[PDB]
Amino acid sequence: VPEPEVVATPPADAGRGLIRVDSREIRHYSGTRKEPDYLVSRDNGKTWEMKAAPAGYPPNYGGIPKESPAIVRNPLTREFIRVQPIGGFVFLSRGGLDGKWLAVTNDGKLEEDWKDPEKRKNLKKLGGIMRTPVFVNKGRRVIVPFHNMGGGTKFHISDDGGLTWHVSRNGVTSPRHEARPPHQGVRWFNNAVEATVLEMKDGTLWALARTSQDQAWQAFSKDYGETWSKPEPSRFFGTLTMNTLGRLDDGTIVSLWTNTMALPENATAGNGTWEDVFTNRDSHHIAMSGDEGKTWYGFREIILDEHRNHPGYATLDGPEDRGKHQSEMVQLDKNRILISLGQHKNHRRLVIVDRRWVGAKTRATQTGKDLDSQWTIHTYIPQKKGHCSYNRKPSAELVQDPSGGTKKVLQIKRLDDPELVNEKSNVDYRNGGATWNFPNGTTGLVKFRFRVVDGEQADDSGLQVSLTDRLFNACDSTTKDYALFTFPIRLKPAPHLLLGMKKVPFTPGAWHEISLLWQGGQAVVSLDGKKAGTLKMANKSPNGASYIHFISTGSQPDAGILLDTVNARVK
Ligand SMILES: [Ca+2]
Ligand SMILES: [Cl-]
């Protein structure tokens, strides 16, 4: 069963503009300010080329150059509706995407002659930053989520195919972040923004929205979007990144999001009215549910950002926002889904994912072979660069296997690098680390092979090992406080595992295997095939474990430990 496959770079940041035309043709429109165009696949998503749009397709009067308008098919008429991410007009098609297009007027009529500037003055303009129109109530209503500068998500609502519009009575909100430890400042405040909506089988609507909390928040509507329930945390971890929900032909729900935890806010973060830095946008994830969201599986990494370790990350080809957050999906066939994801022309991708891969129960890795594609190891140079970015370094390096032979293995240690410190922001990212994804499970077995490096060690040198339910940065020493299960490997006074107050010795100069067998609220730890002790769950999870996280613990430069293989099996 195939791993995720990159097939192209979309012509706009992801999240809007991907649209199926027929059984073989799929398009991704653009935000171009010039003659409209689109990226097109004519082989159901495998290969792609740019094409100019025909003369009757409207230019982008609103929007912005890096974002396409949203294009959605009306399920009753099979025509299309188009809205921009911001500004511009409401366009409806007659005769398809390459047919005639009409703009909605303020008086509920349709305007054919929209290339006349004077006639554009009386066209309907929907306010706010908009996401994707969705058709609900047996196709008879269309809703467009939007947010303004402060009051949270609300919905533009039309009951006549988009000709006339009103606003929902309420929408979705979420609370402000508080500067409590480990935070030294406030996260940029987003009040339940950038919502995705799904119609559930019982007619209820589910809205899932981006927040300043550790997870997306959600609300539900029983009246097709007019009114919404009290907002609550969702099961999808992530902060200040976008969620997308969709449904496959057979009823299966798909959730796409960036399943990450940002580094704690530092001492120069503002009052929350603006963002200082993004440290959580270098991955994208997928989970699925076959039972209307009662249970979920997957939580797999679709892709890691190829540039994530780079010391020029923030400023290569301009300073604008980049990464793997934002996404849109189109099903290709029973087993395959096409996803557009990310921001910036060097980071944006179109990727094909297989559902059988989402449902897999095992994964294995060797650091020397798989570092580039599978391992998050970057630390940050904590100096603001570009638009809300930091440049990076790899925090851990491959070295020869001390035993001999051809394996390269990962050295995880406390770095001697003053560039990873910012005194005024009061942050220090010199502890190297590494983290790796596997399919989600509430029960599982993970095994890893490690060795103490033969050299000088500090008094607190070692490795904190954590099982987590989202991706924590390699250099984040607070991971243990949020982990499902966690324990330290200590190198001094002599090497040992610490399980509670139990010390379990092991030898230097030799490879060792540790296994973690978890079930419910307990994890059994084994060393070289012998039971070593049992760990109580530190944090409950709505989902289960889907990452193992390793971080050095030394406070002075040390030699650290080597990491070779990791294997996971879940049930
Ligand atoms: Ca911040
Ligand atoms: Cl943003």
Q: Cite the annotated binding site by residue number.
A: 222, 232, 265, 275-276
Looking at residue 418, the DSSP 8-state letter turns out to be G
Output the CA 189–ligand 1 centroid distance in Å.
9
Output the CA 265–ligand 1 centroid distance in Å.
6
Domain 5-365 has CATH 2.120.10.10: yes
> How is 531-563 classified by DSSP, letter by letter?
EEEEEE-SS--SS-EEEEEEEE--SS----EEE
Output the CA 532–ligand 2 centroid distance in Å.
46
Closest CA to 311 of 389, 248, 388: 389
Q: How far is it, in rounded angstroms, from Cα 30 to Cα 257?
A: 22
User: How many CA atoms does the CB half-sphere of 507 hold within 13 Å?
Assistant: 5
Q: How far is it, in rounded angstroms, from Cα 414 to Cα 429?
A: 9
Structure tokens at 384: 């603001």
**Neighbour-count burial for 495-507, b at 16+ CB within 10 Å, e otherwise:** bbbebeeeebebe
Backbone region of residue 320 per phi and psi (left: phi > 0; alpha: psi in -120 to 50; beta: other values): beta
Query: What residues have their beta carbon closer than 5 A to ion ligand 1?
Result: 269, 276
Structure tokens at 110: 């349709």
Amino acid at 506: F
* Rounded to 5°, angle at Cα 241 from 566 and 315: 85
Question: Chain-centre distance of CA 137, in angstroms?
Answer: 30
Q: Cite the annotated binding site for beta-D-galactose by residue number.
A: 222, 232
Amino acid at 298: G
Amino acid at 289: S
* Rounded to 5°, angle at Cα 68 from 136 and 91: 55
User: How many CA atoms does the CB half-sphere of 359 hold within 13 Å?
Assistant: 12
Q: Are 448 and 514 in contact (CB under 8 A)?
A: yes
Q: Quick one: which ligand is closest to 194's CA?
A: 2
Structure tokens at 17: 């503009």
Q: Cite the annotated binding site for Mg(2+) by residue number.
A: 265, 275-276
Token look-up 């025909």 returns: 54
For residue 370, give the H/E element and its range.
Answer: helix 367-374
Q: What are phi and psi of 274, to 5 degrees?
A: -150, 160
Output the CA 322–ligand 2 centroid distance in Å.
10
Burial class (CB in 10 A: 0-12, 13-18, 19+), 42: middle
Q: Are 531 and 505 in contact (CB under 8 A)?
A: no
Q: Are strands 471-472 and 260-261 parallel, antiparallel or unpaired?
A: parallel
Output the CA 254–ligand 1 centroid distance in Å.
29
Q: How far is it, in rounded angstroms, from Cα 470 to Cα 417?
A: 28
Amino acid at 344: H
Output the CA 275–ligand 1 centroid distance in Å.
5
For residue 451, give the H/E element and its range.
Answer: strand 443-452
Output the CA 437–ligand 1 centroid distance in Å.
25
Output the CA 306–ligand 2 centroid distance in Å.
20
Q: Alpha carbon of 366 to those of 89, 204, 420, 461, 561: distances in Å?
A: 52, 45, 27, 23, 15
Q: How far is it, in rounded angstroms, from Cα 352 to Cα 13?
A: 17
* Rounded to 5°, angle at Cα 388 from 387 and 394: 110
Closest CA to 184 of 393, 395, 422: 422
Output the CA 63–ligand 2 centroid distance in Å.
15
Q: Quick one: which ligand is closest to 240's CA?
A: 2
Number of CB atoms found within 10 A of residue 23's CB: 8
Q: How far is it, in rounded angstroms, from Cα 487 to Cα 499?
A: 6
Closest CA to 326 of 254, 386, 244, 224: 244
Q: Are 92 and 80 in contact (CB under 8 A)?
A: yes
Burial class (CB in 10 A: 0-12, 13-18, 19+), 181: exposed
Structure tokens at 471: 């991706």
For residue 514, give the H/E element and its range.
Answer: strand 512-519
Number of CB atoms found within 10 A of residue 348's CB: 23
Token look-up 């030394």 returns: 554
Closest CA to 340 of 330, 331, 350: 350
Q: Quick one: which ligand is closest to 389's CA?
A: 1
Output the CA 240–ligand 2 centroid distance in Å.
7
Q: Quick one: which ligand is closest to 258's CA?
A: 2
Q: What is the CA radius of gyration of the chain?
A: 25
Q: How far is it, in rounded angstroms, from Cα 469 to Cα 483?
A: 7
For residue 526, give the H/E element and its range.
Answer: strand 522-527
Structure tokens at 325: 């957050």
User: How many CA atoms does the CB half-sphere of 301 hold within 13 Å?
Assistant: 24
Q: Quick one: which ligand is closest to 271's CA?
A: 1
* E strands in 193-291: 193-199, 205-210, 215-221, 232-237, 244-247, 253-257, 260-261, 283-289
Number of CB atoms found within 10 A of residue 407's CB: 18
Closest CA to 277 of 388, 178, 112: 388
Number of CB atoms found within 10 A of residue 166's CB: 11
Output the CA 288–ligand 2 centroid distance in Å.
25
Is residue 457 helix, strand or coil? coil
Structure tokens at 55: 């003369």
Q: What are phi and psi of 163, to 5 degrees?
A: -80, -40
Question: Chain-centre distance of CA 413, in angstroms?
Answer: 28
* Rounded to 5°, angle at Cα 66 from 13 and 394: 55
Q: Cite the annotated binding site for Ca(2+) by residue number.
A: 265, 275-276
Output the CA 264–ligand 1 centroid distance in Å.
8
Q: Give the chain's count of helices (H) and strands (E).
A: 4, 46
**Neighbour-count burial for 221-236, b at 16+ CB within 10 Å, e otherwise:** beebbbebeebeebbb
Question: Chain-centre distance of CA 52, in angstroms?
Answer: 31
Q: Quick one: which ligand is closest to 187's CA?
A: 1
Q: How far is it, in rounded angstroms, from Cα 24 to Cα 408?
A: 44
Amino acid at 299: F
Output the CA 485–ligand 1 centroid distance in Å.
27
Structure resolution in Å? 1.6
